[PDB]
Structure formats: C-alpha cells, structure tokens
Amino acid sequence: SWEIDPKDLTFLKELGTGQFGVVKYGKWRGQYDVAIKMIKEGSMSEDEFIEEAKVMMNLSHEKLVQLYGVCTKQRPIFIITEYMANGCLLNYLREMRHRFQTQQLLEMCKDVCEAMEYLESKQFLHRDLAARNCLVNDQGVVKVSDFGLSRYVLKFPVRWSPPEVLMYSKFSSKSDIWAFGVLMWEIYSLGKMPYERFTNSETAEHIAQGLRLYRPHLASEKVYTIMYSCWHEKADERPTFKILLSNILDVMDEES
C-alpha cells in the first residue's frame, strides 16, 4: 500500500534539487500531478526510511505535504509527494513582488502551526523545521514538508536549534517549538537567514550568552511575543503547538 509502481509515473519537468537530489514534476496514471523525489544512491538509509514511510502515510493533514508512496524495487528509489506549485517557502518569501501583507504572513505561520500541532498530537517530531522545509501550493497555502526525513540522511541546522540541542543533542517536542519560532522569524523577515551576520559557530556562542533574534519590523509586538515565547531558555517553559495556534488565532483576530 506504501508502494507505487514506477510504470505509473510520467516525468515531465525538473523542479530543482533538494536534500536527497533532484525533484521532478510528473503525472501519476496520466492524470494526477505529483512531485517525484529521486533519492541519490548512498545518500539515504533506505531500509529504515521504507519502514518509516508506512507510518508517514497514515499522517494526513491538510497542511502536511502528503506522501503518496514510494518506489523501492529499483535504484534510485523514489518518494512520491503532493505537488506544490509555488515551491519552497524560503524562495517564495524572498520574492519581493508578492508585496505580502502581514495578514498573509500570519496565515503562513498559522498554516505551519496547524501542521505541527497535528504532528505533536501524533507524537511525531519534524526534527528539521525551517522555511526551506515548507512548500507553497497554487492557492498560497503553506504546508510542512519532509517531516522526520533527516533521520535517514547518511550542515547541522544550528540556527534553528535550541541550546539543549546545541549543548547536549536533546531533541524533543520543544526543539520543534524553538525551530518554529525561528521559522516565524524567517516569515516576518521575508526570508532573511537567521543570525544573518554570524557563522553557525558564532550563533551557538551567542545563543549561549542569551542573544535572541531581533524583532523583524514587519512583526507587531504581539507577533514578536509569540515567536519569542518559542525561545525560552528552559524547554519546559516553551508553549505547545496547541498554545501557539491559539495565540496566532488571537493575533489574527486582533489585526484583522
């Protein structure tokens, strides 16, 4: 049930390259748009991934990029996902022509938070949440992509990592929370790199001294309060995604 017959795939356009190599746009059975991730040999722990794919296919949420299945009886293996016509969220933010309103930026935050509250409720960590791992569909809806997939990569995301990850490799729901707050900073900064003048090493040292990302000027005070709450030093003092969704809904109502 997790397995797609590659004979049902028609490869139509190269979309570009991601973590595991090329991604292509194609059709399934001549009819349905799909994205086809072609997994470069040697890059992925494929047996482990295949087993986890069965779990990932039972995860269904409107704001999660859907895994349609995998093609595993060949090399390279393929991962078949929902096609997202407007590409990577990071590139989308950086296109100044969109002239985003802040209500649109908050909606992107809500989209991601909804997906992450769903993953939280399933006790599933993303482990690499960031604007580069979100995608945008033809209706401007942002969805969370490649959740959990860093576990199978045979370059660490220092700038999306809380102190207990940098110091001790303590991953938890609350390291996804921290990364979400950095993602909100990416959205309201229109895609700047977090800690844009620092190296990864400098970022980690400054985080150790309590530096935090500055308020992007497009974020209101209440929006900054939300992303800042994700960066409490003690992981247990950071909200859940359920609390964050409620805070985002509140600010959406106040700024409507």
Ligand SMILES: *CCC(=O)N(C)[C@H]1C[C@@](C)(Oc2nc(-c3cnn(C)c3)cn3nccc23)C1
């Ligand atoms: C920001 C990081 C990045 O560029 N990623 C992750 C790329 C992987 C990629 C090529 O995958 C997809 N790209 C598109 C797409 C790219 N450009 N347009 C106009 C659309 C669409 N798509 N749907 C699913 C995966 C994927 C983006």
